[PDB]
């Protein structure tokens with residue numbers, strides 16, 4: 001439909017960089033880049049990787065907060081077939097050691113010098129602080145470096161997304177370009193982001209919730225705001241129109257909102273996944289923001305997302321997590337008939353390439369993804385947990 005098959009991640013950027021070069025693409029606490037600027041810095045970073053001899057198919061581990069540079073690192077890596085491995089700042093050191101070793105990167109990018117030092121205890125690989133490596137990036141940007149393309153297959157890995165906690169064996173979903181682009185386009189065919197949206201994203205890009213707000217904004221030409229008591233003010237002052245939520249973040253917002261009758265009237269949508277949104281929270285969001293749709297979704301990192309409740313149906317089938325992503329199938333398992341509880345299984349161009357270097361774990365979950373969640377479809381195709 002508007003669904004993208006066979007796509008490359010960095011092509012999203014190249015398109016918007018040319019289509020709307022002067023529109024605002026990324027804002028963080030420190031400034032704003034237009035799409036041109038984002039394209040230019042991503043190109044520069046690609047030349048920095050070339051300069052360092054990081055090759056197609058290799059990994060970089062990047063442990064950075066939500067700042068513009070991280071998005072440039074992401075796209076610059078994609079443009080060279082290099083695999084982006086985003087990790088959350090604040091991980092415990094033994095946890096980093098485990099994950100870095102598993103990811104097996106060519107180098108590691110840290111948030112600053114203190115952090116670069118802590119990383120150096122836990123790996124022998126080369127470690128660069130973003131401030132220092134960025135001085136080079138800016139030189140390269142100024143010299144116009146990195147503008148050339150290089151061969152990248154839609155089947156090449158773009159990202160590894162670690163889902164394992166610190167008490168678990170390291171485990172990342174292995175994400176090829178095609179699947180990412182497709183999933184972004186399929187999500188967007190339901191949610192309807194567009195070029196005058198301002199997306200307020202409080203989720204780290206180390207989680208696919210944030211990464212896909214980078215991608216969906218880039219896809220549509222929207223503006224992404226990379227973002228505590230101040231939350232309501234941030235929202236209203238950014239002019240935020242779209243906000244991905246998780247239930248704890250929604251409760252906080254409804255608590256905070258009673259203390260501010262100016263609200264944030266620009267908000268038109270909240271999109272919830274990761275956990276079940278309780279009715280009381282939904283009601284409070286609608287009351288504080290009657291202009292906004294509250295949209296239930298369900299997913300796993302293994303295929304990015306599984307179901308979305310169409311926005312226009314937000315008041316119906318209160319127990320459902322919605323319909324399959326467009327271009328994908330859900331079935332319940334031996335195919336069970338409607339109403340019959342079984343394992344939720346998923347088929348489509350969003351199902352990712354398995355877990356990185358873990359044939360054994362991959363084998364049990366994976367061309368059909370077995371989620372280990374249980375539920376049923378009703379007659380219409382809507383998905384429910386349990387019975």
Ligand SMILES: N[C@@H](CC(=O)O)C(=O)O
Pocket residue numbers: 208209273274297298299300301304305306
């Ligand atoms: N990846 C899921 C959420 C999750 O796995 O926590 C989604 O974006 O719907």
